[PDB]
Design a protein around this ligand. Structure first.
Ligand SMILES: [Zn+2]
Length: 314
């Protein structure tokens, strides 16, 4: 029998020596098999494959533990989906735009570009080693693995319509936000006052207004009694806050926010751009860059810097 030595892996760190029969496909010997994202399941070993690393699915206890420790998921289709995405994202270009790693437009990826740009402007530490390692590479300019992981974690395929708010929620669920705390008060003229404390991801995300200042002053929401009540921020402890809303025309003022996402389109398709407030307002659209002193557009998400806030409302 003719053979070569190859290595299998689920995390591309821990390698497992294999001797493969060159007369059988990889799939016949390992199950679904991938070589830097390419599906080689139906391929027979080549001599140039000797010594190379192949991803496989977790099909024994060692690999199951290695995969969970690296990715913090046990979804059976995760690795196949990660590899399927990577086969595309490894072909994308990741230019440095105004000091940040962006993504050249491809494969309807504008939501991923503004998510990637945003991450580089807020204080966030990921928990899965896979995201820690891939984010480090992304910041350096090699973002293919990070982008493919975002797709895999969010159960999105390359080319599929994505929402920035939902994408950030997934990423935040895999980040250490345990120190983040939000205290809110809701005041109804009929029912009185009710305080609520939120933690973790729920402490840094709000859906309903783009304005952090409005959230501090009070937003109108329905009370269960039927009257409109006012909800306002009592206390905030976090390094950033994310304020989101359905797209609406909104003015972004230099120096009053960190960055923002703009969505032009409708519920079936559209396009995202990124706005960042630095020495002026920069609009990053994949590889494209423009600047302006003022900015108005259909904004969906705005990010703000924070440390500790306490209301003066009594
Ligand atoms: Zn009420």
């Amino acid at each position: 029998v003719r053979t070569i030595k190859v290595f299998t892996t689920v995390d591309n760190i821990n390698l497992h020596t294999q001797v493969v029969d060159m007369s059988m496909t990889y799939g016949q010997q390992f199950g679904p098999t991938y070589l830097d994202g390419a599906d080689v399941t139906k391929i027979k070993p080549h001599n140039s494959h000797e010594g190379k690393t192949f991803y496989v699915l977790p099909n024994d206890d060692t690999l199951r533990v290695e995969a969970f420790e690296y990715y913090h998921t046990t979804d059976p289709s995760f690795l196949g989906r990660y590899m399927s995405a990577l086969n595309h994202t490894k072909k994308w270009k990741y230019p440095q735009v105004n000091g940040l790693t962006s993504i050249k437009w491809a494969d309807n990826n504008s939501y991923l570009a503004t998510a990637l740009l945003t991450l580089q402007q807020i204080e966030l530490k990921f928990n899965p080693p896979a995201l820690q390692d891939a984010y480090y590479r992304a910041r350096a300019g090699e973002a293919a693995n990070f982008c493919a992981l975002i797709l895999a974690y969010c159960n999105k395929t390359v080319g599929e319509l994505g929402d920035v708010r939902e994408t950030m929620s997934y990423l935040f669920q895999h980040a250490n936000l345990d120190s983040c705390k939000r205290v809110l008060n809701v005041v109804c003229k009929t029912c009185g006052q009710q305080q609520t404390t939120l933690k973790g991801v729920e402490a840094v995300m709000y859906m309903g207004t783009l304005s952090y200042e409005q959230f501090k002053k009070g937003v109108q929401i329905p009370c269960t009694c039927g009257k409109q009540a006012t909800k306002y921020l009592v206390q905030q402890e976090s390094p950033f806050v994310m304020m989101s809303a359905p797209p609406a025309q909104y003015e972004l003022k230099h120096g009053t926010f960190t960055c923002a996402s703009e969505y032009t389109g409708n519920y079936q398709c559209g396009h995202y751009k990124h706005i960042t407030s630095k020495e002026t307002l920069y609009c990053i659209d994949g590889a494209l860059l423009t600047k302006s002193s003022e900015y108005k557009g259909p904004i969906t998400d705005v990010f703000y810097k924070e440390n500790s806030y306490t209301t003066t409302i009594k």
